[PDB]
Design an enzyme around this catalytic site. Structure first.
Site, short mmCIF file in Angstrom:
data_model
loop_
_atom_site.label_atom_id
_atom_site.label_comp_id
_atom_site.label_asym_id
_atom_site.label_seq_id
_atom_site.Cartn_x
_atom_site.Cartn_y
_atom_site.Cartn_z
N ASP A 268 0.85 -1.20 0.00
CA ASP A 268 0.00 0.00 0.00
C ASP A 268 0.88 1.24 0.00
OD1 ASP A 268 -1.84 2.00 0.60
OD2 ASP A 268 -2.86 0.87 2.17
N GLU A 270 1.12 4.56 0.45
CA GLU A 270 0.60 5.75 1.09
C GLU A 270 1.51 6.17 2.23
OE1 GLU A 270 -4.01 5.93 1.47
OE2 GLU A 270 -3.50 3.83 1.29
C1 LIG Z 1 -6.01 -0.39 2.35
C2 LIG Z 1 -6.35 0.95 2.94
O1 LIG Z 1 -7.49 1.22 3.31
N1 LIG Z 1 -5.34 1.84 3.03
C3 LIG Z 1 -5.54 3.21 3.52
C4 LIG Z 1 -5.56 3.26 5.05
O2 LIG Z 1 -4.23 3.62 5.45
C5 LIG Z 1 -6.55 4.20 5.68
O3 LIG Z 1 -6.61 3.92 7.09
C6 LIG Z 1 -6.63 5.08 7.91
O4 LIG Z 1 -5.38 5.72 7.86
C7 LIG Z 1 -5.36 6.98 8.56
C8 LIG Z 1 -4.01 7.60 8.33
O5 LIG Z 1 -3.02 6.74 8.90
C9 LIG Z 1 -1.70 7.13 8.67
O6 LIG Z 1 -1.39 8.30 9.40
C10 LIG Z 1 -1.60 8.18 10.82
C11 LIG Z 1 -1.26 9.53 11.40
O7 LIG Z 1 0.14 9.71 11.21
C12 LIG Z 1 0.66 10.96 11.60
O8 LIG Z 1 0.46 11.22 12.98
C13 LIG Z 1 1.09 10.26 13.85
C14 LIG Z 1 0.63 10.57 15.26
O9 LIG Z 1 -0.80 10.53 15.31
C15 LIG Z 1 2.60 10.30 13.66
O10 LIG Z 1 3.12 9.24 14.45
C16 LIG Z 1 2.90 9.99 12.20
O11 LIG Z 1 4.31 10.02 11.97
C17 LIG Z 1 2.14 10.94 11.28
O12 LIG Z 1 2.64 12.27 11.48
C18 LIG Z 1 3.58 12.71 10.52
O13 LIG Z 1 2.97 13.18 9.33
C19 LIG Z 1 2.03 14.27 9.50
C20 LIG Z 1 1.52 14.66 8.11
O14 LIG Z 1 0.55 13.76 7.54
C21 LIG Z 1 2.70 15.45 10.21
O15 LIG Z 1 1.67 16.35 10.61
C22 LIG Z 1 3.52 15.02 11.44
O16 LIG Z 1 4.36 16.09 11.86
C23 LIG Z 1 4.41 13.82 11.15
O17 LIG Z 1 5.49 14.18 10.29
C24 LIG Z 1 -0.69 7.10 11.38
O18 LIG Z 1 -0.97 6.98 12.77
C25 LIG Z 1 -0.96 5.79 10.63
O19 LIG Z 1 0.03 4.80 11.00
C26 LIG Z 1 -0.35 3.93 12.04
O20 LIG Z 1 -1.28 2.94 11.62
C27 LIG Z 1 -0.80 2.07 10.57
C28 LIG Z 1 -1.92 1.07 10.28
O21 LIG Z 1 -3.14 1.74 9.92
C29 LIG Z 1 0.49 1.38 11.00
O22 LIG Z 1 1.02 0.70 9.85
C30 LIG Z 1 1.52 2.37 11.52
O23 LIG Z 1 2.64 1.70 12.13
C31 LIG Z 1 0.92 3.29 12.58
O24 LIG Z 1 0.56 2.60 13.80
C32 LIG Z 1 1.47 2.76 14.85
O25 LIG Z 1 1.65 4.13 15.14
C33 LIG Z 1 0.47 4.81 15.59
C34 LIG Z 1 0.83 6.28 15.68
O26 LIG Z 1 1.19 6.80 14.38
C35 LIG Z 1 0.03 4.18 16.91
O27 LIG Z 1 -1.16 4.81 17.40
C36 LIG Z 1 -0.24 2.69 16.67
O28 LIG Z 1 -0.59 2.01 17.88
C37 LIG Z 1 0.98 2.01 16.07
O29 LIG Z 1 2.04 1.88 17.02
C38 LIG Z 1 -0.79 6.00 9.13
O30 LIG Z 1 0.56 6.35 8.86
C39 LIG Z 1 -5.64 6.74 10.04
O31 LIG Z 1 -5.73 8.02 10.67
C40 LIG Z 1 -6.93 5.97 10.20
O32 LIG Z 1 -6.95 5.65 11.60
C41 LIG Z 1 -8.23 5.59 12.20
O33 LIG Z 1 -8.99 4.42 11.85
C42 LIG Z 1 -8.37 3.18 12.24
C43 LIG Z 1 -9.27 2.05 11.75
O34 LIG Z 1 -9.37 2.03 10.31
C44 LIG Z 1 -8.16 3.17 13.75
O35 LIG Z 1 -7.45 1.97 14.09
C45 LIG Z 1 -7.34 4.39 14.19
O36 LIG Z 1 -7.30 4.48 15.61
C46 LIG Z 1 -7.99 5.67 13.70
O37 LIG Z 1 -9.25 5.75 14.38
C47 LIG Z 1 -9.78 7.03 14.69
O38 LIG Z 1 -10.38 7.67 13.56
C48 LIG Z 1 -11.49 6.95 12.97
C49 LIG Z 1 -12.03 7.83 11.86
O39 LIG Z 1 -11.03 8.04 10.88
C50 LIG Z 1 -12.56 6.63 14.00
O40 LIG Z 1 -13.58 5.81 13.42
C51 LIG Z 1 -11.96 5.92 15.20
O41 LIG Z 1 -12.97 5.66 16.18
C52 LIG Z 1 -10.84 6.78 15.76
O42 LIG Z 1 -11.44 8.03 16.17
C53 LIG Z 1 -10.67 8.77 17.07
O43 LIG Z 1 -9.72 9.59 16.39
C54 LIG Z 1 -10.30 10.54 15.48
C55 LIG Z 1 -9.15 11.29 14.84
O44 LIG Z 1 -8.28 10.45 14.11
C56 LIG Z 1 -11.24 11.47 16.25
O45 LIG Z 1 -11.90 12.30 15.30
C57 LIG Z 1 -12.27 10.67 17.02
O46 LIG Z 1 -13.06 11.54 17.83
C58 LIG Z 1 -11.61 9.62 17.91
O47 LIG Z 1 -10.88 10.26 18.95
C59 LIG Z 1 -6.93 4.69 9.35
O48 LIG Z 1 -5.91 3.81 9.83
C60 LIG Z 1 -7.89 3.89 5.09
C61 LIG Z 1 -9.02 4.76 5.60
O49 LIG Z 1 -10.23 4.25 5.04
O50 LIG Z 1 -7.86 4.09 3.67
C62 LIG Z 1 -6.69 3.99 2.83
O51 LIG Z 1 -6.36 5.31 2.61
#
Ligand SMILES: CC(=O)N[C@@H]1[C@@H](O)[C@H](O[C@@H]2O[C@H](CO[C@H]3O[C@H](CO[C@H]4O[C@H](CO)[C@@H](O)[C@H](O)[C@@H]4O[C@H]4O[C@H](CO)[C@@H](O)[C@H](O)[C@@H]4O)[C@@H](O)[C@H](O[C@H]4O[C@H](CO)[C@@H](O)[C@H](O)[C@@H]4O[C@H]4O[C@H](CO)[C@@H](O)[C@H](O)[C@@H]4O)[C@@H]3O)[C@@H](O)[C@H](O[C@H]3O[C@H](CO)[C@@H](O)[C@H](O)[C@@H]3O[C@H]3O[C@H](CO)[C@@H](O)[C@H](O)[C@@H]3O[C@H]3O[C@H](CO)[C@@H](O)[C@H](O)[C@@H]3O)[C@@H]2O)[C@@H](CO)O[C@H]1O
Ligand SMILES: [Ca+2]
Length: 432
Positions: A268, A270
């Site tokens: 993937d 992204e």
């Molecule tokens: C196939 C397919 O579908 N593919 C994709 C798929 O990827 C999409 O899935 C969603 O992805 C998004 C984005 O994920 C990526 O980014 C996030 C954020 O990363 C940035 O911030 C981090 C800190 O938060 C930093 O660590 C990181 O470095 C990033 O920051 C850098 O970059 C930004 C610029 O963009 C700069 O501003 C910064 O300075 C910095 O440079 C990231 O966290 C993700 O990575 C984690 O997850 C993936 C797996 O998904 C792992 O491979 C990674 O290792 C990593 O996990 C580990 O690290 C994280 C911390 O980063 C730890 O928490 C974790 O335990 C691990 O150790 C990606 O890189 C996600 O946001 C979506 O997440 C939501 O949904 C999933 C379920 O699908 C939940 O599990 C997750 O908790 C999130 O849930 C919240 O939001 C949902 C709605 O979107 C909601 O339904 C949930 O209830 C929950 O709601 C709560 O949060 C909301 C706000 O987010 C809030 O509104 C609400 O009130 C609640 O409080 C999801 O994974 C899908 C989407 O359909 O589609 C394709 O695109």
């Protein structure tokens, strides 16, 4: 001079994974010719056991030879020439044997032999095709039959135990989801090695460390477990590795799938940032670089699935080094609301016809009408993303009706679920 090459006739693949789900497996071996043959054109095929050491060295694999007494060619291995289709073929039957191990890939290397003097064989690749055979007779619970659509499910393993795959069965007891992805390990830069590496967050690592109890029970019942790879906010990415960088990263992915006894990968593209073009492992982001990584990964684990999310620059270039994508994209799944499309010589059997976002709601439902539409369209897969026990009401609602069309058996209402990192099957919904 009439150049020949060999491939499996049913799949058109030079390298074909065979899953034995019964006591026999039948196919044809097909020699393709570049010119119309004449009346004297002839050839045979034979198992070429000596070639297996050459193959294993080239791929850094260790496949054992499938017992030759279990493999039969019709008509003494003589290929029947079809002048009008520039081809010649013979039936090959693979019998399941005794003394074969579960969960082991065996090889049948097949060579063109005794070809007539009008036929030219350019190299050892053109001379051979290969079957990579797995005995699946006992790991039969996800196998729903010949030619049915199959399921592909992503778990957000940060939050959900992938043993919840086992919550999804048809009324006839079969498991719905043929393939599941652990979403996701990451590609990230390793400064100490000056190259990308696989980086696993603590949730991914916990599953791998505990694969015996949290992942292998899925495989025992026939579910394929893939490691998801995802970009992760640095200079490395799945569509921006150079040729050398892709070769090295492909080997690391294959090493994870071997070490943890998994079934392949999802890529993937992204969340990566722009590459450092001065680093020799990286290159300009492009679909050509993504295809290079897919090709190199399949070479490093030819027995395992190489699959992609069609998003970003991950999918679209149809050949690498003259090798068509049919050989190195096994499954492509598309963004929610879209259907995937084949490239090269792929068919829609390698493509998703629906992608359902189970956490956020988009992409539609696997209804009776949608199931029939996808069958009519020739699609092989339906994809789902991020199911969770807390949302099973919605998830299973979106699966009503489709199973009767796809399989003659609807998805059953869930009665079990699993908590994160816990092997215990809990009662659904009482124990939520
Ligand atoms: C196939 C397919 O579908 N593919 C994709 C798929 O990827 C999409 O899935 C969603 O992805 C998004 C984005 O994920 C990526 O980014 C996030 C954020 O990363 C940035 O911030 C981090 C800190 O938060 C930093 O660590 C990181 O470095 C990033 O920051 C850098 O970059 C930004 C610029 O963009 C700069 O501003 C910064 O300075 C910095 O440079 C990231 O966290 C993700 O990575 C984690 O997850 C993936 C797996 O998904 C792992 O491979 C990674 O290792 C990593 O996990 C580990 O690290 C994280 C911390 O980063 C730890 O928490 C974790 O335990 C691990 O150790 C990606 O890189 C996600 O946001 C979506 O997440 C939501 O949904 C999933 C379920 O699908 C939940 O599990 C997750 O908790 C999130 O849930 C919240 O939001 C949902 C709605 O979107 C909601 O339904 C949930 O209830 C929950 O709601 C709560 O949060 C909301 C706000 O987010 C809030 O509104 C609400 O009130 C609640 O409080 C999801 O994974 C899908 C989407 O359909 O589609 C394709 O695109
Ligand atoms: Ca694209």
């Amino acid at each position: 001079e009439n150049n020949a090459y060999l491939r499996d006739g049913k799949s058109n693949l030079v390298s074909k994974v065979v899953e034995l789900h019964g006591e026999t497996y039948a196919t044809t071996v097909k020699m393709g010719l570049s010119k119309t043959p004449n009346t004297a054109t002839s050839a045979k095929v034979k198992i070429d056991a000596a070639y297996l050491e050459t193959y294993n060295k080239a791929h850094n694999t260790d496949f054992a030879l499938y017992p030759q007494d279990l493999v039969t060619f019709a008509n003494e291995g003589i290929l029947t020439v079809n002048a009008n289709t520039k081809s010649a073929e013979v039936e090959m039957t693979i019998r399941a044997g005794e003394g074969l191990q579960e969960d082991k890939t065996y090889a049948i290397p097949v060579a063109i032999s005794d070809q007539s003097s009008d036929i030219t064989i350019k190299d050892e690749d053109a001379k051979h095709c290969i079957y990579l055979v797995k005995d699946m007779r006992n790991a039969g619970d996800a196998y729903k039959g010949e030619g049915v659509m199959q399921g592909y499910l992503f778990f957000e393993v940060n939050d959900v135990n992938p043993l919840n795959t086992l919550s999804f069965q048809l009324e006839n007891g079969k498991l719905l989801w043929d393939v599941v992805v652990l979403f996701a390990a990451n590609i990230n830069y390793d400064a100490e090695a000056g190259r990308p590496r696989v980086q696993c967050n603590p949730n991914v690592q916990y599953l791998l460390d505990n694969n015996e109890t949290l992942l292998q029970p899925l495989r025992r019942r026939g579910v394929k477990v893939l490691l998801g790879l995802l970009g992760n906010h640095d200079i490395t990415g799945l569509a921006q590795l150079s040729e050398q960088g892709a070769k090295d990263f492909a080997r690391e992915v294959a090493q994870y799938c071997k070490a943890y006894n998994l079934d392949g990968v999802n890529y993937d593209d992204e969340y990566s940032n722009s590459p450092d073009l001065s680093n020799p492992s990286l290159t300009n982001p492009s679909t050509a670089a993504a295809a290079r990584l897919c090709y190199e990964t399949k070479q490093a684990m030819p027995d395992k699935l190489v699959t992609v999310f069609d998003w970003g620059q991950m999918y679209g270039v149809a050949t690498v080094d003259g090798v068509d994508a049919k050989e190195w994209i096994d499954i492509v799944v598309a963004n929610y609301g879209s259907a995937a499309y084949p490239i090269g010589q792929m068919t829609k059997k390698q493509c998703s016809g629906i992608s359902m976002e189970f956490n956020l709601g988009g992409g539609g439902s696997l209804s009776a009408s949608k199931a029939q539409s996808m069958i009519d369209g020739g699609y092989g897969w339906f994809m789902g993303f991020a199911p969770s026990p807390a949302k099973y009401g919605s998830v299973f609602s979106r699966l009503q009706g489709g199973g009767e069309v796809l399989y003659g058996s609807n998805v059953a209402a869930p009665t079990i679920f699993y908590k994160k990192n816990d092997p215990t099957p809990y009662k659904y919904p009482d124990d939520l």
